[PDB]
């Protein structure tokens, strides 16, 4: 069974005001082409495009908390409706206070409550769940693994809340490792 693509450009982490364009591939036949967000339960948009019928374009001028989740795309076709796309997930940052981020075990933490940290380079990501301490800091704890100045990290980190898993803060501040 055929299956939509689905992806972000330029990424699918994106400040909020800033734009974003989410894209679906299908094939030459695929008649129509539709959005669908978990949590949403009637379609998040649909197109019926011209051309060459293979790709739609869903574009997001300015990156709000409402378009922050996880999306599947879908094309119908005379076969019928396509399976799936692979669920993208839709990231907005910018919408708590950035934790603070230093030292190889780095440490992301805040006063500001968080129920996760997620540490990225500047192109990969890991999360975790936080913990608060006795003196009252969420933070968490990322081993890195070879620093060497042969593979040097660029590293922001993020926290979120249980409830918008896909709405993270602002980035914490640039951090360079080994020196």
Same mark, same amino acid.
């Given at each position: 069974? /055929? ?11 994106? +400040?909020?005001?800033? +734009?974003?364009?989410?894209? =679906? $591939? ?5 008649? @129509? %082409?539709?959005?669908?967000? @978990? ?7 649909? $197109?019926?495009? !011209? ?13 709000? @908390? ?6 599947? =795309? %879908? %094309?119908? /076709? ?9 669920? !993208?997930?839709?990231?907005? #940052? *910018? ?6 981020? /230093?030292?190889?075990?780095? $440490? =992301? *933490?805040?006063? &500001? ?13 890991? #999360?975790?769940? +936080?913990?608060?301490?006795? +003196?009252?800091?969420?933070?968490? &704890?990322?081993?890195? *693994?070879?620093? #060497? ?5 660029? &590293?922001?980190?993020? *926290? /979120?809340?249980?409830?918008?898993? $896909? ?13």
């Amino acid at each position: 069974l /055929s299956k939509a693509t689905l992806w972000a450009e330029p990424g699918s982490v994106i +400040s909020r005001g800033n +734009s974003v364009t989410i894209r =679906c $591939q299908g094939t030459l036949e695929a008649q @129509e %082409y539709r959005l669908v967000k @978990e949590g949403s339960p009637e379609p998040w948009d649909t $197109q019926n495009p !011209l051309e060459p019928k293979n790709k739609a374009r869903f574009s997001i001028p300015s990156m709000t @908390e409402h378009h922050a989740g996880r999306y599947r =795309c %879908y %094309y119908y /076709s005379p076969a019928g409706w396509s399976e799936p796309s692979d669920p !993208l997930e839709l990231v907005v #940052t *910018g919408f708590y206070n950035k934790p603070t981020l /230093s030292a190889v075990t780095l $440490q =992301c *933490g805040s006063r &500001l409550r968080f129920d996760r940290f997620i540490l990225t380079e500047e192109k990969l990501s890991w #999360t975790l769940d +936080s913990q608060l301490t006795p +003196s009252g800091q969420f933070q968490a &704890l990322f081993p890195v *693994g070879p620093v #060497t100045p042969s593979h040097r990290w660029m &590293l922001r980190c993020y *926290g /979120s809340r249980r409830h918008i898993l $896909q709405v993270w803060s602002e980035p914490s501040d640039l951090l360079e490792i080994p020196v």
